[PDB]
Amino acid sequence: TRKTYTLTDYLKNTYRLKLYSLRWISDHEYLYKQENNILVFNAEYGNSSVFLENSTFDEFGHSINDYSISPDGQFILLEYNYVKQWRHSYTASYDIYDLNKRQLITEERIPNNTQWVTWSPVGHKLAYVWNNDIYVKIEPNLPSYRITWTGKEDIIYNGITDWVYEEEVFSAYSALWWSPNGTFLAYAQFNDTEVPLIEYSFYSDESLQYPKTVRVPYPKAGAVNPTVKFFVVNTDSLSSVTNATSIQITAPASMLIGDHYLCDVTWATQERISLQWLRRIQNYSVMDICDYDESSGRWNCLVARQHIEMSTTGWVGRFRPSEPHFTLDGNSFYKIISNEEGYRHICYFQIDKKDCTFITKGTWEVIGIEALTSDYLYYISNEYKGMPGGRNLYKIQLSDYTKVTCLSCELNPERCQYYSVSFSKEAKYYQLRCSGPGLPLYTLHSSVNDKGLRVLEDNSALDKMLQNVQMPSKKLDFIILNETKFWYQMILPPHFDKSKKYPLLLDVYAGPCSQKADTVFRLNWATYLASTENIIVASFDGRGSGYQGDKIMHAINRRLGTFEVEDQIEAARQFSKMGFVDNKRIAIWGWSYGGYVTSMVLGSGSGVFKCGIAVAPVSRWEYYDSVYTERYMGLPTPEDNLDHYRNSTVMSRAENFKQVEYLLIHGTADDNVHFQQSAQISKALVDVGVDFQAMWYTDEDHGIASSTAHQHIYTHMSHFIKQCFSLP
Amino acid sequence: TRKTYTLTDYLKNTYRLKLYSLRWISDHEYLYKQENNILVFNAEYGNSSVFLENSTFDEFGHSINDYSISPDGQFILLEYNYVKQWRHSYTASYDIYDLNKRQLITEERIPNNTQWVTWSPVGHKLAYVWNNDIYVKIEPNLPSYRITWTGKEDIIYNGITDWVYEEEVFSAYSALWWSPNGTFLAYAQFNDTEVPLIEYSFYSDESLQYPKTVRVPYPKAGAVNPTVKFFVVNTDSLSSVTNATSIQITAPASMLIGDHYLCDVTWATQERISLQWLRRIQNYSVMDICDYDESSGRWNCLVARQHIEMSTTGWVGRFRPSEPHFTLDGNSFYKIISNEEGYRHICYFQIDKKDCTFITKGTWEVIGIEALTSDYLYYISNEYKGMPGGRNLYKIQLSDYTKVTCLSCELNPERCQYYSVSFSKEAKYYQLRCSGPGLPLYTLHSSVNDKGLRVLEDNSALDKMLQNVQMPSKKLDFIILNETKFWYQMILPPHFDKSKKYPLLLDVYAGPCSQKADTVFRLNWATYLASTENIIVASFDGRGSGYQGDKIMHAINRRLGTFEVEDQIEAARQFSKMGFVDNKRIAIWGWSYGGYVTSMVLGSGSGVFKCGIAVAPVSRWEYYDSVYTERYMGLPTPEDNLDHYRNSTVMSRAENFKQVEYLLIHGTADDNVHFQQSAQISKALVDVGVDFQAMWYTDEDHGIASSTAHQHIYTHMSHFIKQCFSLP
Numbered sequence A, B: 001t002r003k004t005y006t007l008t009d010y011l012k013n014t015y016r017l018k019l020y021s022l023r024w025i026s027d028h029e030y031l032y033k034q035e036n037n038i039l040v041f042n043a044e045y046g047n048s049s050v051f052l053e054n055s056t057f058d059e060f061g062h063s064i065n066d067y068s069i070s071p072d073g074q075f076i077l078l079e080y081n082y083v084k085q086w087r088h089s090y091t092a093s094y095d096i097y098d099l100n101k102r103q104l105i106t107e108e109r110i111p112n113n114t115q116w117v118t119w120s121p122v123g124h125k126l127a128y129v130w131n132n133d134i135y136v137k138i139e140p141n142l143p144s145y146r147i148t149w150t151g152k153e154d155i156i157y158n159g160i161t162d163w164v165y166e167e168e169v170f171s172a173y174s175a176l177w178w179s180p181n182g183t184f185l186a187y188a189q190f191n192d193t194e195v196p197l198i199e200y201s202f203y204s205d206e207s208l209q210y211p212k213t214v215r216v217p218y219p220k221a222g223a224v225n226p227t228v229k230f231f232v233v234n235t236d237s238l239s240s241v242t243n244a245t246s247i248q249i250t251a252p253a254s255m256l257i258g259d260h261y262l263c264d265v266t267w268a269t270q271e272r273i274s275l276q277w278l279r280r281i282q283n284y285s286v287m288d289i290c291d292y293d294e295s296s297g298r299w300n301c302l303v304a305r306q307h308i309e310m311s312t313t314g315w316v317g318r319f320r321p322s323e324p325h326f327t328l329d330g331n332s333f334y335k336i337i338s339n340e341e342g343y344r345h346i347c348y349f350q351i352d353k354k355d356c357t358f359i360t361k362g363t364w365e366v367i368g369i370e371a372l373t374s375d376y377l378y379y380i381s382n383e384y385k386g387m388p389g390g391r392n393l394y395k396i397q398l399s400d401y402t403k404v405t406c407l408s409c410e411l412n413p414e415r416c417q418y419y420s421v422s423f424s425k426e427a428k429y430y431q432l433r434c435s436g437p438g439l440p441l442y443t444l445h446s447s448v449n450d451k452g453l454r455v456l457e458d459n460s461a462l463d464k465m466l467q468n469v470q471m472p473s474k475k476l477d478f479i480i481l482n483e484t485k486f487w488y489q490m491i492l493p494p495h496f497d498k499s500k501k502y503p504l505l506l507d508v509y510a511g512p513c514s515q516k517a518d519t520v521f522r523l524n525w526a527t528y529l530a531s532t533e534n535i536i537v538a539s540f541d542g543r544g545s546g547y548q549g550d551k552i553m554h555a556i557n558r559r560l561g562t563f564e565v566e567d568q569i570e571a572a573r574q575f576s577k578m579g580f581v582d583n584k585r586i587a588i589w590g591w592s593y594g595g596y597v598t599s600m601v602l603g604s605g606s607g608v609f610k611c612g613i614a615v616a617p618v619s620r621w622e623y624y625d626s627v628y629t630e631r632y633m634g635l636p637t638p639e640d641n642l643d644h645y646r647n648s649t650v651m652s653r654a655e656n657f658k659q660v661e662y663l664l665i666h667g668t669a670d671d672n673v674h675f676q677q678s679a680q681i682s683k684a685l686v687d688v689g690v691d692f693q694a695m696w697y698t699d700e701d702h703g704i705a706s707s708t709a710h711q712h713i714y715t716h717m718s719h720f721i722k723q724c725f726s727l728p
């Protein structure tokens, strides 16, 4: 009898998914790491050579965390002493290796504790942030030019984001943008002077006698936000003037009237930069397009080139206003915008005309624009077979919009329905990344004729191994409610028999624009639960979910904690009605927004669920950050949406928890969803006399991803579920 | 057939013990609160009169927390707006009611947020502390004199103790000492300027958007300690035009050489005061005896009247050097000190003589000196029947030490073997409080011929109720380990049948000088476990325990976490050999020091225990405070006792928890044994891959005593124990 996929298999990663991560260095070559040495491949023929022998730095004295070759291939940036900070930020030491003369640079070295470093887009200039100020090096071995002098720990951030801009606005730590050929360096400056601090203890190693108090400028809903300023400096003048002037580009008067955010920066040409602002009440965005005035050294943004977006049935964009993709001459651009029917499609704009032209349409959505050439625009969408959970690459002829070719749909329709892509520098070649429903498949293609060049990685090794395992199957389908279809997926135990009653675990997330029913292949906790414990693990995308139009996505606008919670309960009822579910054993679990929904469901009094597990849950929206929360909830004030803020807390449903088995889990150093959120849930339960299970994870954050903690939480949750389902 | 003592009975206090808390106001009368009314009783005949009507303050407008009548009976201090701080500290608002003119005082009232207040010992002067400074009021309606002006929150403490002196040294917030007739007011001043701060989050009500960070000057082992100065001020010569002058009494030179503490202050006469200082290495104490010099208005402490105490086998005193008990003329005093055999007995000192004479002796110990007259010294000891866990009142004839009379031993030997006493002002009368093995019994007696005047409270009402309940019994016995007897107690289930095998729960504390095997009657969690769940709850006093001599108590000197832990395993090992114990179901639990020992035991790899519960445990001695920790462990430096500090942590034994079920509980706002201690335990268990159960209690301190948390924890622990013992 074949063995099953066990918890240890999952926690020990015995069945490794292979991938093929390459880095395009030009329009025909990419770097690939093999046997620890860096190889360089010729896309056209597939041949290669050793770019950097794995022995080059065997005596460097440190373990290199990552590397980075300058655009002109003359230098390599070595990163070490990596110290993670938030989701994207981290600190590290850096050294530069001169590839030509094959030597390490020992003078004018990048400072220790550098917060961020980036090569210019061309050549080998370097811009970095250290002690919250920006510095530029024209040559790797020469002295740096100081660009800002205002940097101040936890107060003024130049070139880097503060906590909330990192996590919610830019999804990146850097706040600097080189112009195309590297002449100009644009950057933002954040001022968190009056932003309140979240404070929590960090215990560290046992040797630390007194716990440390971590203090981070973090604006909770309705609190004082950081303010921001934008500047551009001409780096080509640095070696000619003692102190190059950073020219500020101010936000439009429509933004200065109140609190606002800088939500996008995209260079259009060597002398044209576009930037976008968003009002704190995120239903109005303004994009400015600014040209360099070579006679005044200033930047001017013609109001005739200003573009505005306004919210209709909800907020603006999926998670932020959409980014612009400029044609080469910088005189027009494309943005994904929801059309009159509520579906997000590509709209083509002339920089000085306010009305754009939709070039795609249909009851489906464009996921992203991937590349743009003089003749074609390439994008990913879920048009194929009307499956919102599928993803394919398409190419549209710019001179004839009726000519749309799907590049990935038919390659291997049964094995591949979820694609991501990576084009070479000028889109001459592209690597396709198939992630499901079958095993991941990586292929390389020629753009000139859209012909497959060769398979890069097919996971044949893993496929061989999995043949000796009773793997679970995955079903993706929909149910119709109120004449609209909602998708769901089920991870089904091996040899699934529909005449039997299986216990069911509802795996939920359900945040705004979320998607938990898709065609991606995953090896995770649910795999073990289905394969070894014979538990059906399901997920449902109800109101509030994404990629299916505004009608569904905006249903929870200003109403978090309502429909997305109820649809999850209704989903469970619908699943039991399918007849292969044991009504006495229906559980529910989620992490993050999933923890919030799980708790709301467990405290709803529905009686449908026997037990549930919430990991790092939000419990009351006033505890979460301003940018994310206010986008969907507005402000927590009586003149706006306070009533719903107070009506959507987990705490107010404490008494109903007497009807279920609850397990609450949270990392104590969670900088994102503060441990505070679960501390208030537990106290509310204690106050009404409800018994429950709990687990805190010392010094773990929102990912509870350290090796030991990861294994410990899934082991702990496994016992809770098996116990709840009376499983040996 | 009748009901058992249930968990709800314990949690809802269904069965309550009646008390008789009286307040002696002279040598002939005492105050007693009845029907919310304050009555005055004549000890001789038992007749009384109403002293204060319960309705007198029906329109006071504030809920009165407590009251304090001035010594002369003329005034009553009304305490309200009570806000708890640490174990003894709290702030409150006060009002003074004139009992002669039956009127509330409205002029010059005590400020709000007063930290401590106290009447002079005679008459009606007042001394209080506010904003860390001392104030004196000669009359309740007159303006107060400012005594100190250096008071500074968390830095300078005048008249009140800082965290460590409150908890570990004086067991009181107050640091003011009135002379016998109220003329002088002595006080200590603490300086915490360089004491590190423990920091932890306080979440508060749900409405608080950002958690608050509590910061408390708290010296952990080896850290910088607060410094102290001592002053005496004449309150009969205060001026409303000039600032009060405080006379300092510097510590002796042998103390000023290094870090030290003030550990006792005791007035001997109207013009003689004694002080005792202890070196930071708590093995050397120096008592000074100072006289007021009318000529220079200074206080002189003759070196000839200096008394030194040194420790050979361990530290000095049980928890601190013993207090002196001066005769009427203040020329000699009595103090409990360990004799040459290591047994604590009463020693008679001459103020200008180095050697003291022991007046009691034997293989037992004097627990405390209770009253002194020219003819007799009254004290409590565990001499009767050689039972270290029993307590009786004795009097010894000062003119003939061979004449010792037990005053409580034979009153009711079956019901009463544990007494406490309260003497009237000049020891003319005494109230005996019997607390076990039977129901509490309170009686009044006259000293002249030791007549038993009357029964004040006999709990006959509770006795009648308990007759309808299947109550457990208590067996107190001993086992012999290496020629030494060690005592234990077992709470046995109703109808105990020695032919059956019962599961056993070892209830442990085991800290230095602890005693968990005694004759006290208690209604607690163990009562329910034995009565309703038929679980035997045992406690054992092994090496390190108190009241049995230094040989036993000092066995763990400089070695906490060794013998006291080993002896608990040995006792369980023995209990498990008895015919009535189920060796497959032996558990262990403890709180505080008890949590540390339980964790050390569960991590010992002994295999004797199936499961255990640790509530707010200490996990590594460097996390606990200096005064308590260094007393038993010395300093955590390589030259002193660092290796043992490092070998005695719970964390180093994590791997051994693989074969036991462990439940770890801790309040997040524990200012005493910081949540840090458990946070480090949980991390070590996660690091070795050991699963366990946990529960944190939001905003609860070391007592986890709020009504809801109390009920929640015992409910959660009860489910854990039953589950471990397979009890329905």
Ligand SMILES: CN(C)C(=O)[C@@H]([C@H]1CC[C@H](c2cccc3ncnn32)CC1)[C@H](N)C(=O)N1CC[C@H](F)C1
Residues within 6 Å of the ligand: A167, A168, A169, A170, A171, A319, A320, A511, A592, A593, A594, A618, A628, A672, A673
């Ligand atoms: C799902 N996920 C990772 C998130 O929602 C987090 C981010 C992710 C990037 C988004 C985001 C921001 C800007 C561009 C962009 N393009 C795609 N996403 N995206 C903005 C939301 C969120 N901050 C969070 O941690 N919680 C935690 C509890 C509450 F549920 C929200």
Ligand SMILES: CN(C)C(=O)[C@@H]([C@H]1CC[C@H](c2cccc3ncnn32)CC1)[C@H](N)C(=O)N1CC[C@H](F)C1
Residues within 6 Å of the ligand: B167, B168, B169, B170, B171, B319, B320, B511, B592, B593, B594, B618, B628, B672, B673
């Ligand atoms: C039992 N108990 C309440 C204590 O031991 C606490 C105090 C009580 C007064 C004592 C004390 C001090 C001065 C005189 C005196 N006379 C009698 N006791 N006593 C000194 C010890 C201790 N600070 C503590 O909380 N922990 C917590 C974990 C570690 F176990 C010690």
Ligand SMILES: *[C@@H]1O[C@H](CO)[C@@H](O[C@@H]2O[C@H](CO)[C@@H](O)[C@H](O)[C@H]2NC(C)=O)[C@H](O)[C@H]1NC(C)=O
Residues within 6 Å of the ligand: A040, A041, A042, A045, A047, A048, A049
């Ligand atoms: C991949 O192989 C090709 C062809 O073999 C290599 O092309 C070289 O190109 C240079 C520049 O035009 C010529 O001077 C050489 O003669 C070519 N070499 C050969 C063998 O034909 C190319 O360098 C290889 N690329 C890698 C990364 O190995």
Ligand SMILES: *[C@@H]1O[C@H](CO)[C@@H](O[C@@H]2O[C@H](CO)[C@@H](O)[C@H](O)[C@H]2NC(C)=O)[C@H](O)[C@H]1NC(C)=O
Residues within 6 Å of the ligand: A150, A156, A191, A192, A193, A194
């Ligand atoms: C960051 O913002 C703060 C405002 O919150 C600025 O601080 C003010 O600066 C002015 C001018 O120096 C002072 O008069 C105010 O008293 C300051 N207010 C506060 C609250 O500090 C600060 O200058 C800004 N810093 C930068 C670099 O822009």
Ligand SMILES: *[C@@H]1O[C@H](CO)[C@@H](O[C@@H]2O[C@H](CO)[C@@H](O)[C@H](O)[C@H]2NC(C)=O)[C@H](O)[C@H]1NC(C)=O
Residues within 6 Å of the ligand: A149, A150, A243
């Ligand atoms: C480079 O120019 C900037 C911009 O003026 C200088 O920054 C100013 O410095 C002065 C004095 O230190 C401050 O009063 C101003 O508020 C600063 N303005 C800004 C925008 O920071 C900076 O000091 C100059 N650096 C050098 C070396 O001269």
Ligand SMILES: *[C@@H]1O[C@H](CO)[C@@H](O[C@@H]2O[C@H](CO)[C@@H](O)[C@H](O)[C@H]2NC(C)=O)[C@H](O)[C@H]1NC(C)=O
Residues within 6 Å of the ligand: A181, A182, A183, A234, A236, A270, A271, A292, A294
């Ligand atoms: C990058 O683009 C910049 C901006 O267009 C170029 O700089 C200009 O170059 C022209 C000469 O063709 C000068 O007359 C202008 O004064 C320059 N403008 C500025 C702001 O410096 C620059 O030459 C380009 N760099 C490269 C390597 O092509």
Ligand SMILES: *[C@@H]1O[C@H](CO)[C@@H](O[C@@H]2O[C@H](CO)[C@@H](O)[C@H](O)[C@H]2NC(C)=O)[C@H](O)[C@H]1NC(C)=O
Residues within 6 Å of the ligand: B181, B182, B183, B234, B236, B270, B271, B292, B294
């Ligand atoms: C409390 O005791 C003090 C000190 O013995 C008494 O004050 C002394 O009284 C005598 C006699 O009147 C004077 O000669 C001294 O000068 C006083 N000494 C001081 C320091 O004041 C005081 O009278 C007593 N108070 C009561 C109520 O008995």
Ligand SMILES: *[C@@H]1O[C@H](CO)[C@@H](O[C@H]2O[C@H](CO)[C@@H](O)[C@H](O)[C@H]2NC(C)=O)[C@H](O)[C@H]1NC(C)=O
Residues within 6 Å of the ligand: B029, B040, B041, B042, B045, B047, B048, B049
């Ligand atoms: C207890 O009883 C005595 C009477 O035996 C009370 O009376 C004594 O004190 C009274 C006021 O203090 C006087 O009015 C009596 O004359 C006096 N009698 C004697 C014989 O001394 C006494 O007050 C009572 N005490 C209480 C608290 O009620």
Ligand SMILES: *[C@@H]1O[C@H](CO)[C@@H](O[C@H]2O[C@H](CO)[C@@H](O)[C@H](O)[C@H]2NC(C)=O)[C@H](O)[C@H]1NC(C)=O
Residues within 6 Å of the ligand: B150, B156, B191, B192, B193, B194
């Ligand atoms: C309280 O103690 C501090 C020291 O812990 C006293 O200040 C001293 O220490 C300072 C360093 O913190 C030195 O810089 C000072 O010179 C030294 N003396 C003074 C007067 O500050 C402080 O005075 C003490 N306060 C009181 C009221 O005694």
Ligand SMILES: *[C@H]1O[C@H](CO)[C@@H](O[C@@H]2O[C@H](CO)[C@@H](O)[C@H](O)[C@H]2NC(C)=O)[C@H](O)[C@H]1NC(C)=O
Residues within 6 Å of the ligand: B109, B110, B111, B112
């Ligand atoms: C301490 O605070 C209390 C409450 O503020 C003060 O008591 C009175 O409070 C009322 C309102 O509740 C005010 O109108 C009065 O002015 C306050 N004083 C009096 C005498 O009524 C109290 O005054 C404060 N303590 C002191 C010493 O002033």
Ligand SMILES: *[C@H]1O[C@H](CO)[C@@H](O[C@@H]2O[C@H](CO)[C@@H](O)[C@H](O)[C@H]2NC(C)=O)[C@H](O)[C@H]1NC(C)=O
Residues within 6 Å of the ligand: B281, B283, B310, B311, B312, B313, B634, B639, B640, B641
């Ligand atoms: C009081 O206890 C201390 C600490 O144990 C003793 O001081 C020294 O302790 C070290 C161990 O840390 C020993 O090696 C020394 O022999 C001790 N003496 C000295 C002078 O350092 C101290 O001796 C004890 N005092 C008494 C009277 O027993």
Ligand SMILES: *[C@@H]1O[C@H](CO)[C@@H](O)[C@H](O)[C@H]1NC(C)=O
Residues within 6 Å of the ligand: A035, A036, A037, A054, A055
């Ligand atoms: C590169 O280093 C690896 C060690 O990670 C070694 O196994 C391999 O043989 C080296 N590459 C070559 C081509 O030898």
Ligand SMILES: *[C@@H]1O[C@H](CO)[C@@H](O)[C@H](O)[C@H]1NC(C)=O
Residues within 6 Å of the ligand: A109, A110, A111, A112
């Ligand atoms: C970084 O710090 C290390 C350790 O202090 C030091 O030896 C090294 O020279 C530093 N590097 C730079 C570039 O300053």
Ligand SMILES: *[C@@H]1O[C@H](CO)[C@@H](O)[C@H](O)[C@H]1NC(C)=O
Residues within 6 Å of the ligand: A281, A283, A284, A310, A311, A312, A634
């Ligand atoms: C802008 O947002 C506010 C608050 O959400 C709303 O009242 C207003 O109607 C919105 N305007 C538009 C054009 O959507």
Ligand SMILES: *[C@@H]1O[C@H](CO)[C@@H](O)[C@H](O)[C@H]1NC(C)=O
Residues within 6 Å of the ligand: B035, B036, B037, B054, B055
């Ligand atoms: C005082 O109040 C209590 C209840 O608070 C009441 O029962 C009692 O009768 C009152 N005292 C008197 C003397 O009536």
Ligand SMILES: *[C@@H]1O[C@H](CO)[C@@H](O)[C@H](O)[C@H]1NC(C)=O
Residues within 6 Å of the ligand: B149, B241, B242, B243
């Ligand atoms: C008393 O001392 C304080 C603080 O030193 C001072 O401010 C005040 O003026 C003094 N009053 C007199 C009468 O000296």
